[PDB]
Amino acid sequence: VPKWIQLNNEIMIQKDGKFQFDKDKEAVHSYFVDYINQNTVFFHNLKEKLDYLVENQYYEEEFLSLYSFEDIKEVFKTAYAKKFRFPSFMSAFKFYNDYALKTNDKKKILERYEDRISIVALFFANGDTEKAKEYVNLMINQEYQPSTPTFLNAGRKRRGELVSCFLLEVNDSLNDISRAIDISMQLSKLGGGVSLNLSKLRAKGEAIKDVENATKGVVGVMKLLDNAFRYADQMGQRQGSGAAYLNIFHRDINDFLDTKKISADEDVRVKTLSIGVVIPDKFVELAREDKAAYVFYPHTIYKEYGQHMDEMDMNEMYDKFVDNPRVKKEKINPRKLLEKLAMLRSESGYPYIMFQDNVNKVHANNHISKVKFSNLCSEVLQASQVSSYTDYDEEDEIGLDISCNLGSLNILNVMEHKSIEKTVKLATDSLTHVSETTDIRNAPAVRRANKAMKSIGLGAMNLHGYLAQNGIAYESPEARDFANTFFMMVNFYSIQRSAEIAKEKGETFDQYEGSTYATGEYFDKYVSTDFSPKYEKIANLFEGMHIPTTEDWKKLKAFVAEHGMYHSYRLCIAPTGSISYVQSSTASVMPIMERIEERTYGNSKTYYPMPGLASNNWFFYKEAYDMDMFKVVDMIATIQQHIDQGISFTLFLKDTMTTRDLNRIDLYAHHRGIKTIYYARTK
Amino acid sequence: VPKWIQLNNEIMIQKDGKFQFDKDKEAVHSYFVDYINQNTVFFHNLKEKLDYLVENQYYEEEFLSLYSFEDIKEVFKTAYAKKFRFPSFMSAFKFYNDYALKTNDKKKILERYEDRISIVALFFANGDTEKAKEYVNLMINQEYQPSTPTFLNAGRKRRGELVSCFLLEVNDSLNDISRAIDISMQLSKLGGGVSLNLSKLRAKGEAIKDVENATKGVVGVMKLLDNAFRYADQMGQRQGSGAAYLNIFHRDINDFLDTKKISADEDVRVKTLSIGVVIPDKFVELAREDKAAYVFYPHTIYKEYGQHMDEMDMNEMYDKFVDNPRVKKEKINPRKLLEKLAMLRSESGYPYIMFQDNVNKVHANNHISKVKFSNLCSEVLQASQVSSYTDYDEEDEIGLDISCNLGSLNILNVMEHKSIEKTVKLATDSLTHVSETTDIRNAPAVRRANKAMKSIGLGAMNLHGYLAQNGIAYESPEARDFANTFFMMVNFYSIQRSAEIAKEKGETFDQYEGSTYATGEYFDKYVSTDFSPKYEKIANLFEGMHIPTTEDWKKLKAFVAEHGMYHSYRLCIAPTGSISYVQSSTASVMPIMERIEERTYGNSKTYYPMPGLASNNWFFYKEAYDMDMFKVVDMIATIQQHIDQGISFTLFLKDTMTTRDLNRIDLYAHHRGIKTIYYARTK
Amino acid sequence: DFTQMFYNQNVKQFWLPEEIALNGDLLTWKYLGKNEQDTYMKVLAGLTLLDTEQGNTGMPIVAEHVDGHQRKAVLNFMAMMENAVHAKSYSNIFMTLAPTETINEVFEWVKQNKYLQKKAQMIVGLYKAIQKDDEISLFKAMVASVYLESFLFYSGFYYPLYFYGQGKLMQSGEIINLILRDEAIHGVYVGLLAQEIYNKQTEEKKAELREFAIDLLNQLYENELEYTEDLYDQVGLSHDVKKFIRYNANKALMNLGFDPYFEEEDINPIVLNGLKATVEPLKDDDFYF
Amino acid sequence: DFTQMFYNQNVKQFWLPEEIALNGDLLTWKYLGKNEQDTYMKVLAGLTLLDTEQGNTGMPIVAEHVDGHQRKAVLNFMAMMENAVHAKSYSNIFMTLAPTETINEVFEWVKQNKYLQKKAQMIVGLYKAIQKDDEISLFKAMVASVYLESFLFYSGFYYPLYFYGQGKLMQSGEIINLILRDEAIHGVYVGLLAQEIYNKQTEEKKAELREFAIDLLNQLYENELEYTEDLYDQVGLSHDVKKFIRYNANKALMNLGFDPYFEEEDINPIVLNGLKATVEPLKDDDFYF
Numbered sequence A, B: 001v002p003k004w005i006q007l008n009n010e011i012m013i014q015k016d017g018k019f020q021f022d023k024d025k026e027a028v029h030s031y032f033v034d035y036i037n038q039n040t041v042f043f044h045n046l047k048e049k050l051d052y053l054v055e056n057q058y059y060e061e062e063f064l065s066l067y068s069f070e071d072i073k074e075v076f077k078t079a080y081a082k083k084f085r086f087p088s089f090m091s092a093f094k095f096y097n098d099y100a101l102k103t104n105d106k107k108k109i110l111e112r113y114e115d116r117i118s119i120v121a122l123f124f125a126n127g128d129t130e131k132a133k134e135y136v137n138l139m140i141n142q143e144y145q146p147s148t149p150t151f152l153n154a155g156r157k158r159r160g161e162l163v164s165c166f167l168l169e170v171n172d173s174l175n176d177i178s179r180a181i182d183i184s185m186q187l188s189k190l191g192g193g194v195s196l197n198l199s200k201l202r203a204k205g206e207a208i209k210d211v212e213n214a215t216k217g218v219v220g221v222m223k224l225l226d227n228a229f230r231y232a233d234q235m236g237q238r239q240g241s242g243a244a245y246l247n248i249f250h251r252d253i254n255d256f257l258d259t260k261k262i263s264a265d266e267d268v269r270v271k272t273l274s275i276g277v278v279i280p281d282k283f284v285e286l287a288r289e290d291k292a293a294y295v296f297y298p299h300t301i302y303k304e305y306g307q308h309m310d311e312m313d314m315n316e317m318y319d320k321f322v323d324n325p326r327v328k329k330e331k332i333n334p335r336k337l338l339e340k341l342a343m344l345r346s347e348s349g350y351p352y353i354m355f356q357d358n359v360n361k362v363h364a365n366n367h368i369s370k371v372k373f374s375n376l377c378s379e380v381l382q383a384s385q386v387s388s389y390t391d392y393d394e395e396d397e398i399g400l401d402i403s404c405n406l407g408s409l410n411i412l413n414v415m416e417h418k419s420i421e422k423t424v425k426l427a428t429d430s431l432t433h434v435s436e437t438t439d440i441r442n443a444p445a446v447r448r449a450n451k452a453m454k455s456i457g458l459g460a461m462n463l464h465g466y467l468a469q470n471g472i473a474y475e476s477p478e479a480r481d482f483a484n485t486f487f488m489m490v491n492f493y494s495i496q497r498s499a500e501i502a503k504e505k506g507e508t509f510d511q512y513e514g515s516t517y518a519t520g521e522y523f524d525k526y527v528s529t530d531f532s533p534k535y536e537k538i539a540n541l542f543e544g545m546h547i548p549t550t551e552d553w554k555k556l557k558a559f560v561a562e563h564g565m566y567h568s569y570r571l572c573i574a575p576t577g578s579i580s581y582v583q584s585s586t587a588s589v590m591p592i593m594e595r596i597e598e599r600t601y602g603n604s605k606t607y608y609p610m611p612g613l614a615s616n617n618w619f620f621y622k623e624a625y626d627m628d629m630f631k632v633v634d635m636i637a638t639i640q641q642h643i644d645q646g647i648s649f650t651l652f653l654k655d656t657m658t659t660r661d662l663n664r665i666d667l668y669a670h671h672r673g674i675k676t677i678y679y680a681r682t683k
Numbered sequence C, D: 001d002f003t004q005m006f007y008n009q010n011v012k013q014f015w016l017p018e019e020i021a022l023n024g025d026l027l028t029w030k031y032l033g034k035n036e037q038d039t040y041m042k043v044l045a046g047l048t049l050l051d052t053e054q055g056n057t058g059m060p061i062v063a064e065h066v067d068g069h070q071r072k073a074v075l076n077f078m079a080m081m082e083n084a085v086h087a088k089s090y091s092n093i094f095m096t097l098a099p100t101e102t103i104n105e106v107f108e109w110v111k112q113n114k115y116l117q118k119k120a121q122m123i124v125g126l127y128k129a130i131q132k133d134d135e136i137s138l139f140k141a142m143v144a145s146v147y148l149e150s151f152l153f154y155s156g157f158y159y160p161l162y163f164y165g166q167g168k169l170m171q172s173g174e175i176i177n178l179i180l181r182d183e184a185i186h187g188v189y190v191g192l193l194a195q196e197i198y199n200k201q202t203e204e205k206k207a208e209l210r211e212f213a214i215d216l217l218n219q220l221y222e223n224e225l226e227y228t229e230d231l232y233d234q235v236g237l238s239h240d241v242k243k244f245i246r247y248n249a250n251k252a253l254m255n256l257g258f259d260p261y262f263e264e265e266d267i268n269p270i271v272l273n274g275l276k277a278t279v280e281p282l283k284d285d286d287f288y289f
């Protein structure tokens, strides 16, 4: 066993009844003085390194050609001047195993952390040396972390796409289904997770040109998509991951759910395609009143009204659907469907739950389209227009397929540096650059939506780490007050940066004029309610930083009205799974699953303590499963009120609790304004 | 139990030690006195019937509008003047259960046999009343039978395409694979059987964008195609049928074959995807000499030579591939592979066997392309060019995808009417009309090849029926003499009609000038070898009909040289599954499987004796399984020497014979010039 | 004179329920009334119980007492079919058509149903009464086995056949026809073994054995009548099924070499309408002709 | 946790003797020396005789005493393979290679052979000692069964695998390989059933059962060494056969959840080449907060 492995395992060997957390630090030293420094490839100077990486097809030469070598040297020197040290063994291990650039045979390490950060910063700046240094300082301080696609692939010749998630709308036609399968394979080839809205597809037993009971429903398309994602599995490196979203009022909703039952037959079971359910407020109202609900056949509704079932408001059209004899429907028990959802989430963690009305009551771009589904991580909530892929030799009507670039603020590092504004603006600029340089030649709706919406996702990580390292319980009202203030600041500065980009470029996102940003409605709660901290401890935490007031929000509203906004969507809180290790941060705004996690790598086992875990903050690092899910819902709703897109909200459940407890948590989330629920992980 | 079913089951009841075959005739009468006439919709006049069928979206207005009502009435009167009577119960049952037009509620019969024949004739003639009457006389004499798609769908508004055999070339790309899946779905939606060539696809463990061990091979593509064919199942009417062809020198050939093993796992086995193997002469030579063979990685060959492995002659390329270090290959035992093929055919009848050099040594259009694969029934053998389907908003390079037009001569009815020439020419004209009226807007290469090649398949059936009713054993040399003469006359008149159509329209098929028809090579064996019958009995059978001599063939060769040939391909012998029942004929040129076949429909049992079966010809109606497969191979080769495309050749084996016997039959078929082997049906 | 041909027939009839895809029955099942579905589930559950005991107990115990390696091989194969193929196929049908709770309930229902318990008690009691080297106890168990194979299954078989005959539940029906094809040959084979033992007896002993067989048949018959009424009254078919079981009782007697006991009756015509290879290597001479 | 998985693996391995044509073995058989032909015949008869005990007693007796419908079905399937498939396969090999008189003499010899009899009767003795409702006696018999399936057959399998790995007697070697593949899974399955019993015991009882298993293994192993020299010295192979016995003894122990007894050894390369959360309804007022 390696020396650093033994040093890391020495953490759990208690001394005087206490964990040896400091041993972890020793491990990193070993991991660098025995493996990383020996396995790294050193050159005489930076010129030889850059030339070797360029000619050997490791780096794209275009982004490096925008800078003179003196500027690149200055950027690299700025990166190395911080003398960044990984405080935990797992941070360095995760970076050098998942994100550091290696040779073709993967026998040596070509990129250090500073090298990777410098390359990403130079790609972000697009020829601006000062901007590149700003990005270097932002990432080496670990205030901002680009998503895994962006951080791993920026400036690389053998790179994939920098966009993490893609959302596709599938129209009810064989041509559209085949095009959706093709685009899903193309985007999984690019490495991104693909989500498909199957609510427009007509249910099982519908007519294909006057021959009835002919359609296979959404389950056949689900099987096709599952095989497509199995085939396109990132060249066999990462398993192809897809998501299917169906409205709960679709007739196939049961069969949909039956794809995830552990007793499902092979002709129905789907195993590589995640499932999500979109629940309008009408379904929750029907379940609450115990009135029997009706699921609908989408094609009959489309024939009668000319629009898809998910294209209009069910809260106002459900009674018209039910009373219409030309609309076909089936009777269901909404409470039984809710119990089935809870049982399925207990068994397998599926489906994702999207509260459609919670998303669309604060959605700023309802004029473009209502949000009808979410992404594979159930945090992207954007307007999408379905595409009409016609026959060959016929022009296709290209719609809008959602796609946003992810980037997370490290809350602990951002607040320690007292740089919410600067970090938010620089992250917005980096995400705007990632969107601008993204061009996908096989997904036309994705390309058009990227060019028009200009949507980005700016997330946050290390919420629980910051709260526990500052002596604040994650479930406490003080923690929710901190989240309210911090994310109001993040939203304020993201809107300010979006408006500044719109002013400097003279262009807004497409159809911005009909948005609530243009009409000023979006700023209502920000121009009437003060989001400054209500607790003295939180206010002290925010000292040295100008917390925006109602007057600052009014000025920002006027600025947006004058100049517009460059981005249709700005903030989305992704799960941030593996890149949180490198940043020494807790995953996303979720509470920690465990204080010390035991992970098996190779034939060895490693223990990763939570960042900053110690004796004095052991009980502030409360495990998520031990927490009240209602207070976690309260925290997520408090954050969500300042996030325009959704938050990947994983439910952390105990084995003792029943499906009724899961249903109660889901209904409280819906009541509190939670937009989406990601996972039901049971301990 | 209905009266006609009792009268049909009375056949097996033996009187005086003989089957009551004549009772079947009585059954037909009952089937018409009790059921057909009662459930047949009658109109006051044909005008009312046509108006009702057109208005209720049963027929098409376009083809009926080309004639005055007097001409349509005259065509219907010509059809009804024959007073055609089905000689067996199963003929009428199959027609009125499969082909007769029924109401939307499927309880009444709108079309009789004469009505359907008149409608198909009017569709064929395209406005010529005399030509329509000629077609009516052809089909009511049952000399020619349009295929199930053409016969069932001609003149019907609610219909699939008139072509059901489609051959697709799949290029080695994700875009091409997705396009192939889409086209397969679209053609299965039209009701056609789709065959895909997977030899150009790179094997498992190949590089994608210079990353190693990334390709899933052809088995993942087969899984995708199997899912696509399961999804597209004729609006839930018939099981989606598809075929995949792989060259035996493709490295995936074992895994390909492993998709049909019973022991194969769920992630390996494809259930609705037929498989065929293309066997070049090089593989047979390697197996014969017991030298170990090499299966090659197609992408390495493409990188080294710039052409696909299946696009070049393996006979001259195999040694260069083996000696090339940059071509990756795996060692195999060709005799072990042959034994595996025989074992798989014994277990499941798969794969289909295509002898590439047997096809291509007589292929007339090798300049366009060599025949690389066959159809789902393993009888279509045509030149195909792969298409380069690029990314979106980029122009695709459309190639040639095979789609031939099926139609079968009834050898008994044709020869008893002494009308080989007239029937062949009229069938060629009808096939040309159906090929010209076919327009598929979702298969670009299929449409382009249909427009360019103008390839049709004119088959024959009732060969064994005709031979048995004339006191000739199917395995006798006299039967082979008759087949030689009859199919040489069929080829002569098909070529003459093709040249006449080319002269009339002033156009040949695309790239005809490079064909062996243009150079006169095709006629070589016809201008030197006399194909007149060598037996007096066969000559007396051909009495009253002019048998083309060598001088006639020289005149035809000169005529083709002067005027060209309209069809790239003219003759292919399809299995003729259900139309053989309606025509009261034995299926294809195959020998009969059973003298009397027992079938189970809904409730009932039913009994179909072979047409013309009696005590006198009971011995001549020898069952296929009791026959020597070498003599069946000899007869099929005798026919194949006059057929430009292949013949659906099913092997009929006993359970006693082993895989050595199957391999011997396959090798004798290869030796005798058999182009394709369809199935290995074990009794 | 017969074991080898039964051996060959049994092994050539080998099958597994997984060979038949069942999702095609989903719609015709959905369309049946609640009464029809209830009777169908219960009928197949009664069959499952019979095959469970025939496989676990009946066939293995008869195999143990019958002399000759080939006779034992046939009986062992038949035993395997009972519990590894037949009994399991019913679960394949249940798992396709019914939710878990309905499946759980029907298996609970077999445990508490008095007619099904009585028939199992009687048949299994006779199996377990076999004494080594005592041919009379063996004969009695073989009669019981023939009555299970050729008579008792048929109150159950009626309903899948009745649907198959109408073009309903045809995939499940295909499974049932394969099971029935097996039981027919099982009943004949065991019948021939029983006749062997019977033919060794004095005329006086034979007279007693006929009494045993007829008394047992009547006792089983009277119980089967009550079982049939209990299951089929709710679907209106009890009288029709009764005619069918009498028909098959006569076939069971005939399998035992006895004269038919019930008079002939017209059976529902719908139900009547409901009715690796050896490898050689390639020689160099097989490539030349 | 395991019976349905083993059911699947067992039924998908189904095969029949007729699938392999045997006659082509005569083309290599004729070229073997007298000692090679003698050893092969004797080994084959040894395997045949032991496998018959397993088909007539070993598998059926275990199926009888094991509780569980699904286990009884798997065990029935295994018994079927012994009697209907394996026994016919061994007979077919014999009839192909030797004339009737030679077969009768070899079986007479092997039937009288001291080392074959010692092991055959030791195993059969443990099967005969199983008592109703006594899981200790059942466990002891299961140990005996695993030792036969996973260990005792292998001194015999060695020779056909040795020829098979050299290109000799390929048809009969293919048959033997299929048989061996069945015995391997039989040994693993019965091993899991034995571990289930073992795990229900106290620590003292466990130690006592371990001592039983090791003592039995030792007795059988010492007799295997003598059996091996008796058959294989005349063809010079005994040293390598002994390594193969120990390697397979270790597999048998691992099947019973025990540690290997013998040090790891390499095997002859020619032989290697041959080889649910609680559902609680929503009570209302769960929709209000």
Ligand SMILES: Nc1ncnc2c1ncn2[C@@H]1O[C@H](COP(=O)(O)OP(=O)(O)OP(=O)(O)O)[C@@H](O)[C@H]1O
Pocket: A028, A029, A032, A033, A037, A084, A085, A086, A087, A092
């Ligand atoms: N935790 C760590 N994170 C990142 N790099 C590290 C870490 N530990 C060691 N290294 C690398 O290994 C080298 C070993 O030097 P070390 O940290 O022991 O101190 P040093 O030799 O006094 O110099 P310095 O600390 O100034 O780099 C470091 O210079 C650095 O490049």
Ligand SMILES: Nc1ncnc2c1ncn2[C@@H]1O[C@H](COP(=O)(O)OP(=O)(O)OP(=O)(O)O)[C@@H](O)[C@H]1O
Pocket: B028, B029, B032, B033, B037, B084, B085, B086, B087, B092
């Ligand atoms: N074998 C058969 N094949 C086809 N149609 C038949 C057959 N037998 C009877 N029919 C149909 O039933 C009708 C009654 O025929 P039948 O044998 O009673 O005498 P017919 O002289 O042909 O009668 P009609 O006055 O109808 O011409 C036929 O006209 C035809 O439409």
Ligand SMILES: Cc1cn([C@H]2C[C@H](O)[C@@H](COP(=O)(O)OP(=O)(O)OP(=O)(O)O)O2)c(=O)[nH]c1=O
Pocket: A171, A172, A173, A174, A175, A177, A201, A202, A207, A208, A209, A210, A214, A215, A216, A217, A220, B189, B231, B232, B233, B234, B235, B236
């Ligand atoms: C062709 C086909 C379609 N479908 C379903 C899936 C699609 O969402 C739906 C629409 O198919 P379409 O491609 O729209 O078929 P269509 O346009 O010819 O029919 P229509 O005019 O009624 O639109 O039909 C199947 O389930 N199976 C099939 O094989």
Ligand SMILES: [Mg+2]
Pocket: A172, A173, A174
């Ligand atoms: Mg449509």
Ligand SMILES: [Mg+2]
Pocket: B172, B173, B174
């Ligand atoms: Mg390519």
Ligand SMILES: [Mn+2]
Pocket: C051, C054, C081, C082, C086, C087, C179, C182, C183
């Ligand atoms: Mn049974």
Ligand SMILES: [Mn+2]
Pocket: C054, C078, C082, C149, C182, C183, C186, C187
């Ligand atoms: Mn039985």
Ligand SMILES: [Mn+2]
Pocket: D051, D054, D081, D082, D086, D179, D183
């Ligand atoms: Mn055995």
Ligand SMILES: [Mn+2]
Pocket: D054, D082, D149, D182, D183, D186
């Ligand atoms: Mn065994």
